[PDB]
Design a protein around this ligand. Structure first.
Ligand SMILES: Nc1ncnc2c1ncn2[C@@H]1O[C@H](COP(=O)(O)OP(=O)(O)NP(=O)(O)O)[C@@H](O)[C@H]1O
Ligand SMILES: Nc1ncnc2c1ncn2[C@@H]1O[C@H](COP(=O)(O)OP(=O)(O)NP(=O)(O)O)[C@@H](O)[C@H]1O
Ligand SMILES: [Cl-]
Ligand SMILES: [Cl-]
Ligand SMILES: [Cl-]
Ligand SMILES: [Mg+2]
Ligand SMILES: [Mg+2]
Lengths: 263, 247
């Protein structure tokens, strides 16, 4: 629940003529019940970071301390979703794909109820998707399958890499519902999303990367008010006008924003 | 130049139709944006356009009929997941790949599409170890190298940040001006500068097809309306963009 990364940096293939400094001395604290948005350009290396935080790779020069530690059945409470869902598939049927986490960390219990509720809270009908091949689904349906497979066993840490990508409006409101219903449970969420504009109503703290370096680690409220706004979306610039004069735009419907801007 | 023409086109994967009697014309020089909820048939339509799927009904490329093998020969396609069209020990081998069928030229048509998508200097890197956004960039490049009359893109910039999305779309727009047909599937529409048409797909049929105004009017619920446009019709020109630089 209390993931702390200490002077981590990671070097891909240290020895050969390439090395690549994916990460550059990253250190940040992410408390429980906190939702963190990992942002930055395409070279920043946020996916690398979330892979480390999820214990998928070993830093070549760092530690991530959960409360100390490593790896044991702490696995149990980590659930990372890859930005490309197919990079995560292994099963020939959607049911097996989703049921993995339950069958793995909880080999005693019947998975059918759990994977059922998991599937329907990403909008996938059970008797309609359970026996289909994951690879033979639409992009949005693949995204949903991934999300479901990593929320099925209710981990303490829910790491989502580009979870909005490929979903329709209904799919995105389903995802954000998931994020909320895991903040309510006092669980930790970690987000990568180029689309800050949507996620930010539901995020507590932003971190921004830059060639591995961390060039920002403020709060949500302190990111729209203290960060280079050259590349904000219109909505973000608007919320910015609303934070600068005193108000709290993170609680205004897409229309209430407008009214409070011109009228 | 040219013009694809779908007449009474329907498609089944195995079970029930995912496309039910589609009629359309896609003409060089204009740009078509395709929207609709998950499982509506956008990708299937697009693959039928690029000759990647054989569909029921008639499809004409310039008056004459066209099998998939002819359609492929004249529409470049970009996958939702770039990885399924990435192959080659390095990036230049990747771009080079569908310059399969010379070595002289087939090397800066390459680094032209690479400088175009913003991938210059990585041409000697294992494609497999690019970032997600850069893999997408790569796919765009390799399709552009083909130099097809039609560009069929299935959510091409769905993982670039909005500045990058905007710039890539400007590249596409340029290519629209040079007489290339452009059919674009996206869920964002946010980065879209201009468009000639918006098609909406409900459950296998093209529900709507007209101007952008007509689209924001009919009120569809499955498609997110850009905050920028909402902010355009009310408030009007408030010159918000100044905040990006503020002197
Ligand atoms: N396995 C790998 N081997 C070598 N280089 C890698 C590997 N994975 C990532 N890189 C490089 O490390 C950098 C950061 O990668 P990555 O962590 O995917 O960035 P990112 O934040 O996810 N960018 P994006 O998701 O596309 O917006 C890039 O320049 C990659 O080329
Ligand atoms: N390769 C495939 N094999 C079998 N069925 C498929 C395949 N791809 C898609 N389908 C199904 O066909 C229907 C329409 O698919 P598709 O054409 O990808 O819709 P879509 O508009 O692309 N949805 P999305 O990409 O998530 O926004 C869905 O119900 C899918 O389950
Ligand atoms: Cl199937
Ligand atoms: Cl048409
Ligand atoms: Cl809307
Ligand atoms: Mg990433
Ligand atoms: Mg699709």
């Amino acid at each position: 629940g209390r993931i702390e990364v200490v002077n981590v940096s990671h070097i891909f293939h240290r020895g050969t003529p390439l090395e690549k400094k994916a990460l550059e001395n990253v250190s940040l604290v992410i408390n429980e019940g906190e939702c963190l948005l990992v942002a930055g350009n395409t070279g920043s290396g946020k996916s690398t970071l979330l892979q480390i935080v999820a214990g998928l790779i070993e830093p070549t020069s760092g530690d991530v301390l959960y409360d100390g530690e490593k790896g044991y059945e702490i696995r149990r409470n980590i659930g990372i979703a890859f930005q490309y869902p197919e990079d995560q598939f292994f099963a020939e049927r959607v049911f097996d794909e989703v049921a993995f986490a339950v069958k793995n960390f909880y080999p005693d219990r019947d998975p059918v109820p759990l994977v059922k509720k998991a599937m329907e809270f990403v909008g996938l009908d059970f008797d309609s998707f359970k026996d289909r091949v994951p690879f033979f689904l639409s992009g949005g349906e693949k995204r949903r399958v991934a999300i479901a497979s990593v929320i099925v066993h209710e981990p303490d840490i829910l790491i989502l890499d580009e979870p909005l990508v490929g979903l329709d409006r209904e799919g995105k409101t389903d995802l954000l519902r998931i994020v909320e219903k895991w903040k309510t449970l006092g669980k930790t969420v970690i987000l990568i999303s180029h689309d800050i504009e949507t996620v930010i109503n539901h995020v507590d703290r932003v971190v921004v990367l830059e060639k591995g370096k961390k060039v920002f680690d403020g709060t949500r409220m302190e990111f729209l008010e203290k960060y280079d706004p050259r590349f904000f979306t219109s909505k973000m610039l608007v919320m910015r006008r609303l934070v600068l004069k005193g108000e709290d735009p993170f609680s205004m419907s897409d229309d209430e924003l407008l009214e409070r801007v011109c009228n | 130049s040219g013009r694809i023409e779908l007449n009474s086109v329907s498609f089944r994967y195995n079970g029930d139709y995912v496309l039910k009697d589609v009629n359309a014309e896609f003409e060089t020089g204009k740009i078509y944006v395709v929207v609709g909820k998950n499982g509506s048939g956008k990708t299937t339509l697009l693959k039928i356009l690029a000759g990647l799927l054989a569909a029921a009904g008639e499809i004409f490329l310039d008056g004459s009929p066209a099998d998939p093998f002819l359609l492929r020969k004249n529409v470049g396609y970009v996958f939702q997941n770039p990885s399924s069209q990435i192959i080659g020990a390095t990036v230049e081998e990747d771009v080079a790949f569908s310059l399969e069928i010379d070595e002289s030229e087939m090397r800066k048509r390459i680094k032209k599409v690479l400088e175009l998508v913003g991938l210059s200097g990585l041409a000697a890197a294992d494609p497999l170890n690019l970032s997600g956004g850069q893999k997408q960039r790569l796919a765009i490049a390799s399709m552009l190298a083909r130099d097809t009359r039609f560009l069929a893109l299935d959510e091409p910039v769905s993982m670039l940040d909005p500045p990058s999305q905007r710039e890539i779309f400007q590249v596409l727009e340029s290519l629209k001006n040079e007489g290339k047909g452009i059919i674009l599937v996206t869920h964002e529409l946010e980065y879209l500068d201009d468009m000639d048409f918006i098609l909406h797909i409900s459950n296998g049929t093209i529900d709507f097809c007209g101007s952008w105004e007509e689209f924001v009017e009919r009120e569809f619920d499955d498609v997110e309306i850009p905050f920028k446009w909402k902010l355009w019709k009310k408030c009007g020109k408030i010159n918000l963009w100044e905040d990006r630089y503020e002197n």
